[PDB]
Structures are given as structure tokens and as C-alpha cells.
Amino acid sequence: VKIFNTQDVQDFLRVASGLEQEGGNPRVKQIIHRVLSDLYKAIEDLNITSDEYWAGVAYLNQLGANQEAGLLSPGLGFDHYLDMRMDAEDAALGIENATPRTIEGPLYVAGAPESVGYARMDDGSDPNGHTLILHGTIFDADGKPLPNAKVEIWHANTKGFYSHFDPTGEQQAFNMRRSIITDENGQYRVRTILPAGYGCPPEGPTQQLLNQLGRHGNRPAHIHYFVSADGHRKLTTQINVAGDPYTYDDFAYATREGLVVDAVEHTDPEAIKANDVEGPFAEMVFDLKLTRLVDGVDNQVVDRPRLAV
Template sequence: MSVKIFDKPEIQDFLMVLSGLDKPGGNPRMKQIVHRIMSDLFKAIDDLDITPDEYWTGIAWLNELGASGQAGLISPGLGLDHFLDERLDAIDEELGIKNNTPRTIEGPLYVAGAPVSEGFARLDDGTDANGHTLIMYGTVYGSDGKPLPGATVEVWHCDTRGFYSHFDPTGKQAPFNMRRTIVADAKGCYKFQSIVPHGYGVPPGSPTEQLLSALGRHGQRPAHIHFFIGADGHRKLTTQINIAGDPLVNDDFAYATRDGLVPAVTERTDETSIRANNLNGPFAEIEFDVHLTALVNGVDNQINELRKRAAA
């Protein structure tokens, strides 16, 4: 239809009212954001001739999304998390900051309070019968290129069924299974033993899958391992690595794959390597060094305090 009402003065006045810009008090920043978002939504309804039926279908979907707790899942699925990373990259470029280890999305399944280990940690509890042993290690470097003893490496990943501890619908996993915080040793090195994780998909029939299907997209992720890495005088890095060889490395519904975050996986079958790691058989090996960046004028200009979570 050709009917357009967005530009009418009374509609523009209405946007000022509903966002509180016509009144004192309240939060000025919130008013600004709500005014912009509602203006864009009103204009989209006008330009696309969105019908009341389509609108209320969307509202019902939002209700289902909230009830299922999947806002943090659809956010990366719609590219919002990746867009935020791209903006942070652009801000860093303007500041002259080079990120030798790229940032990428956190995802919604971090849990604070994982057990702390010095230098080395065993992540898995050995109960995943389908698990292929993984040894992963690396060095954390500071902005001056030197190793950072005492750097903290928080790591978490899923099991071979694609489930994370604390979010496992089967209840099979113990608390903090495949979650640890490793304090880098005197040489700035970290190392852990676990199992190679598998990729996974969004819950079947969920609001997230419904939307992705309507867009002609899948909801699958490649196998990956999450990290938070921090050290005194440096900005906290949020990143994750993909398992090389996974067919979805370059087709991640969450758009987390980035150059420099797909380290090689080496299969070790020789007795020397097996004995050196106190193992009983072949294992996969990944080396992944991390380069942190310095604080900006003494401040971590990218940390998001509100993403902190209490242990489930």
C-alpha cells in the first residue's frame, strides 16, 4: 500500500512522548536509545506495510524467546554479537591498537566461579565415553611481546553431545565439568587436558530455530573452545577457537569464526608424546598463543561488567 504516516508531525510528536523526551527526569541515554529504536520500528512498519497480524506474530515470538531464555542465543544468530566485535575492532584501529589475537563473541553459556589451577588443569571428568583426548597449551604474551606470568586463562567448552555443564538438559554433567581458570606459570604458559568438543545446534523447535528456519538458515555451530584471558595492566580478551577440520568452521550460525582463531590440530600417536603427557593412548594437540593489549589510559575500554554471571 502507499499509505505512509511516519513523517506526520503528530507521529513525530508521539515518538517524543513515548520515549519521555518531552519530560524532565528519567535517564537521558535511555530516552535517546528508545526514541531511535522506536522510530526505526515505526518506519519499518510503514515502509514494509507490516500488518497487525505480522506484528502480533512477532510479539508472540518474543514472548516465547523470553520464556525459553534464548535472547542470548538469537543475538549472535542475528549477527549482533559479531557486529559489536567489528565496532570494537574499528575503535581499536582508530586508537592505533593492533589485536594480534582477535576477539570474538562470548556466547551465552559462561559460568563464573570455575575451579582455579596453576599452570595446568584437567577440564573433563573422564565420564564422556566418546571423548577423544585433547592437550592444548600456549603462552600468554603482554603488549610488550613478553610472556605474562600469572595471567588468567578461563576456558570452557561442551561435551561430545554438544552440552555444557550447568546447561545440560540431561543433568549428566557435574558442576564445572569442562570449565576451569588456569593461572599461567612463571613462563606465562598455560596447558590443559580435556576432550575434543563437538559442534552443536540450537534447540530443535525453539524460537531461535523457528526464526532461523524462516530465514532459510541453519542453527549449527562448529566445534569450538571459549576463552577469557586477562592480566594486570592489560585488557581482558574474549575469544574462542574453532577446531580445524570441522565442516562448519566457515558456516557458523553465530558468526564467531575469525582469521587467526582456527589453530591446527595435530594427532599424536607416538609413544614419546603419549608418555610425556602421562596418557595411555593417542591424543589431539593444539597450540594457541595469546597476545593481550595494554589498558587504554589505565582503563579497560572494552570490558562489559554486566556480562558477569553468578555460578549456576
């Protein structure tokens, strides 16, 4: 029993997609027609039953009810795939990406405190927090230190929770989220704590689907970056804390060579005083290099829904 390639079904697909309708958006119709065709065909090819189908529809409802579509997305590789496409396009334009891009993730929040050159990111409310001094230089497309660049950093606490998405309700707004404008030497520097790896809500729809694929929902400890500057494209990337068990087994497939960074532990009193901290701390250095706009246009910035507080 096969009906997908019969006139009845093909004509019905055009009707449902609004192809012969006068109103609407032709681009949406075009995409919907393709997606529907593909799904109708997959239902036939894989002999998906009604019981299976409705289980899929129920999952969609709970996926959205839990606001997890942006979490499942990277877990199913879309986020990284979109990055592969941008990389391919840059290669086509002859653009060399000194600092590789990687996924943004769904947890960026607009509105964080802004400062010049330095900022402390945490409020010391984490018991198990280990002091981290993260600093670096931002370079322009010509390799020269870039003053006034805006470096945005966000990461999780030791429990693997992000402010604004913390279930324990423990964190104040923008905790571990800052914008640092680079100083005269093109440098940025922050005092924060070493993040812990992130895990998907174990009871949520994203993890339940991953369980069906025999997969885990963990990410290694990492730090997110947005770096923007006049005359340059906006850089989206992240660094991984070297040594993490999941560095090369991230459920979001965000790891890339060049982004794994070593956290050097400092114990002597000399270093501690020089970075005036209260005791042993970790230090990470990470420089980032920007690319220039293409004929005055940032051909790769992404406009997507982001929480703004």
C-alpha cells in the same frame, strides 16, 4: 495511506518516549525514541499488518520465556558487529591486536575451579570423549611470556552440551570449565576432551526464526578463552578446531583468521608417555598475546549479565 510523517504521529512518538517528561533517564529516552521511530516507520514502509505484528509480539514472548535472546543475538550478527566496532576503535587508537577478539557467546559461567599452570578440565564422564592436550604461552604487550595471567577456558562435551546448560542434566558443576594461572614460563596447559559442534535447540525460538531465513543454527567445534592480566586489557576470543564442516559457516559468524587451530593426533607410545595419558590423544597449541591498558583503562571490557555459581 501513509501517516508516519504527520505531526500527529511525530508528536505521539515524543509522548510515548517520555521526551517531555521530567523524570527518567535521558539516555534511555533517546534510544527508545530512535528505536520506536524506526519501527513505526518500518511498519508503514513494509506495510506490516496487525496479524503480522502480533505474530512478532508472540515470538518475543517465547524468545524470552525460553531465555534465548542471547542466542538469537549472535545468530543475527549483533555480537560479531559489536566486535567489528571494537576493532575499528582499536585501529583508530593505533592498537594492534596480535590475537584477534571474537564473540563471548552466552554460555560463560563465573566461579570455575582455579589452579596454577595445569588443570584437567573434564571428569571423564563422557563415553565418547577423545583426549585433548591444549597448551600455550601467554605474552604481554611487549612479547615476553607473562606469568600469573589468568586464562579462563570453557567448551562443550562430545554431545555439544555445556555444563550448567546441559538438558540431559548429566554434568557436574563446572565440568569442562577452568581458570588456569600461567606458570613462571607464562604457560598454561590443560587436559580435556575434543569438543563437538554446538547446535541451537531445534524446537526453540532461535532455530525456528533461523528456519524462516533458510539458515541453520550450527557452530563448529570451538574452545572459548578469557585472558586477563595486570596492566593489560581483558582478551575475549576462541579457537576453532580446523577441519570442522562449519568452520566457515558458523551461524554466529565468530570465525576469524588466526583462530583456526589444528588438532594434531598422537599415536606413538613415546608421545603418549611424555604427556602421560592412557592412549592416542589430540594435541592443540595456541599462544595468545595481550594488549596493554589505554592510560590505565580497559576501554573494551564488557560488563554483561553472566551466570555465577
